[PDB]
């Protein structure tokens, strides 16, 4: 069984690998298909154990990955796309 201290530390507001959907971040890429369609990004996740608080990023950054783009009938290739990672997270009022 997981000790309260661990359960507590492990779920407390912090940057955790999140599988983020690309069309999500780039809502403008309507006509593109990506492979992968989602990327592994550091993102603020966890709890504050306070109804009035919320986990938010205090320090952001950018990560660049090779994403294959595909525009049906037009072209297909891999290349570089950049995404926002969260480096610091903090519980702040809402």
């Amino acid at each position, epitope marked *: 069984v997981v000790k309260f201290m661990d359960v507590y530390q492990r779920s407390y507001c912090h940057p955790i690998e999140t599988l983020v959907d690309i069309f999500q971040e780039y809502p403008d890429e309507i006509e593109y298909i990506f492979k992968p369609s989602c990327v592994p990004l550091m993102r603020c996740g966890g709890c504050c154990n306070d109804e009035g608080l919320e986990c938010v990023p205090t320090e952001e950054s950018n990560i660049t990955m090779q994403i*294959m*783009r*595909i525009k049906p009938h*037009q*072209g*297909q*290739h891999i290349g570089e*796309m950049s995404f926002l990672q969260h480096n610091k997270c903090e519980c702040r009022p809402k």
Partner: antibody
Amino acid sequence: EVQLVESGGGLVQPGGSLRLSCAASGYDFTHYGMNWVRQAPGKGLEWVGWINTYTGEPTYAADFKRRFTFSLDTSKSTAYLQMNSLRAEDTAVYYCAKYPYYYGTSHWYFDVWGQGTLVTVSS
Amino acid sequence: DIQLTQSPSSLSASVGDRVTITCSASQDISNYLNWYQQKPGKAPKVLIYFTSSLHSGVPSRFSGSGSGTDFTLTISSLQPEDFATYYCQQYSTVPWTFGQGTKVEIKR
């Protein structure tokens, strides 16, 4: 180093068929689409179409869907262009050319080309 | 099919001269135009894409500009090795199309 090596060109009788191969090397064949361009002797460049090497889907410029067919054998990193019912006007140097690695956004230009092979249709 | 018309069709200029070649599209194509240099017996080689991005490895004397339906390729200082035929290519709407080519000859 990236390179495209085409073969299968040559003499063909009017009405005949011919298959050209484009052999890729020095990169991952399935990560970039393959285009086909032809240039009649002393003339301009004409885009024939392209094929998605990840999914297999071919897209042809209108005048070619009828007699030409694009295919691939990813296991050999090779794209093929099958031509049927050739006529004298099909006489040309045929090139295969891969799409480029992009930065942030996509631009459909051909960055590496094969050396081209002359297909001459005649009896 | 979008029609690309270049001009002039050919030209002769001296080493050191500034050469400008023109591409005119039959309809707006935004900045979706590329330029290629083709030397005798070789495949065309991309000089510029997206109207003005200089492809890596291409001498900076080559430059491109324009938009809408009018574009321009410029060689600031013609070198002996710039003898070739230059083509523009739109990627606005399939099928991709090319201009008829401009042959550039060196005058000496």
